[PDB]
């Protein structure tokens, strides 16, 4: 429990009372930049698998339809 969790030393920690500080300091001021900062650090790892899922899904559909489509000669 608390008190026996870990041993730190000389780490001072300042803080403020909730009612004393603005609730949403610069919420959209920096929030947008940060959210955008975040998206750029993760978009290349996340997005291209789902892009090729979209291509495979469309391909399958069209292939499937085409497959079913009757060969005029048939």
Ligand X SMILES: CCCCCCCCCCCCCCCCCC(=O)OC[C@H](COP(=O)([O-])OCC(O)COP(=O)([O-])OC[C@@H](COC(=O)CCCCCCCCCCCCCCCCC)OC(=O)CCCCCCCCCCCCCCCCC)OC(=O)CCCCCCCCCCCCCCCCC
Residue 23 binds another protein, judged by CB under 8 A:
no
Residue for token pair 């978009």: 43
Residue 50 binds another protein, judged by CB under 8 A:
no
In angstroms, the CA 59 to CA 62 distance is: 5
- Taking CB under 6 A as the criterion, which residues in 32-71 touch ligand X? 32, 34-35
Residue 27 binds ligand X, judged by CB under 6 A:
yes
Which of another protein, ligand X, none is residue 35 near (CB under 5 to 8 Å by kind)? ligand X
Q: Residue 31: enclosing H or E segment and its boundaries? A: helix 27-68
In angstroms, the CA 48 to CA 42 distance is: 11
Applying CB under 6 A, the residues found at the interface with ligand X are 27-28, 31-32, 34-35
């Amino acid at each position: 429990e608390f008190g026996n969790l870990a041993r730190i030393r000389h780490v001072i920690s300042y803080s403020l009372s909730p009612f004393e500080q603005r609730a949403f300091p610069s919420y959209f001021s920096k929030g947008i930049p940060n959210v955008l900062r975040r998206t750029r650090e993760r978009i290349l790892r996340v997005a291209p698998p789902f892009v090729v899922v979209y291509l495979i899904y469309t391909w399958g559909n069209q292939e499937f339809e085409q497959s079913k489509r009757k060969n005029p000669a048939m």
